[PDB]
């Protein structure tokens, strides 16, 4: 659970094991989008 | 190999137990090579799509 209000703004680079369930109880329409990567340096 | 694996690797690999770290010399065979596609040999060497 992450709450955004330090700056209380968690956005660390999270694992992606087999799929993800993502939910948002939001109002600021801060939903945009997402990275996905494995090597981060052109290995793939 | 793997199901649906894309191999466009162009960085030098560690062969044997000699770390290269960008030297492309001993134990550092560069992973790419190119064909000799000339109309010289028979069918066993010419391209197909």
UniProtKB/Swiss-Prot annotation, chain B:
Residues 1-30 are annotated as: Disordered. Changing residue 23 to A: Increased resistance to neutralizing antibodies. Changing residue 30 to L: Increased resistance to neutralizing antibodies and human covalescent sera neutralization. Disulfide bonds join 20-28. Changing residue 15 to V: Increased resistance to neutralizing antibodies. Residues 1-48 are annotated as: Receptor-binding motif. Attaches the virion to the cell membrane by interacting with host receptor, initiating the infection. The major receptor is host ACE2. When S2/S2' has been cleaved, binding to the receptor triggers direct fusion at the cell membrane. When S2/S2' has not been cleaved, binding to the receptor results in internalization of the virus by endocytosis using host TFRC and GRM2 and leading to fusion of the virion membrane with the host endosomal membrane. Alternatively, may use NRP1/NRP2 and integrin as entry receptors. Binds to host ACE2. RBD also interacts with the N-linked glycan on 'Asn-90' of ACE2. Cleavage of S generates a polybasic C-terminal sequence on S1 that binds to host Neuropilin-1 (NRP1) and Neuropilin-2 (NRP2) receptors. Interacts with host integrin alpha-5/beta-1 (ITGA5:ITGB1) and with ACE2 in complex with integrin alpha-5/beta-1 (ITGA5:ITGB1). May interact via cytoplasmic c-terminus with M protein. May interact (via N-terminus) with host bilirubin and biliverdin, thereby preventing antibody binding to the SARS-CoV-2 spike NTD via an allosteric mechanism. This is Spike protein S1. It comes from Severe acute respiratory syndrome coronavirus 2. The gene is S. The chain holds residues 461 to 509 of 1273 of the full protein.
């Amino acid at each position: 659970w992450f709450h955004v209000i330090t700056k209380r703004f968690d956005n660390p680079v999270l694992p992606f094991n087999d799929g993800v369930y993502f939910a948002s109880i939001e109002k600021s329409n801060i939903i945009r989008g997402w990275i996905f990567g494995t090597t981060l340096d052109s290995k793939t | 190999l793997k199901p649906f694996e894309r191999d466009i690797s162009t960085e030098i690999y560690q062969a044997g137990n000699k770390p290269c770290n960008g030297v492309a010399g001993f134990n550092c065979y560069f992973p790419l090579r190119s064909y000799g596609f000339r109309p010289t040999y028979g069918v066993g060497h010419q391209p197909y799509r």
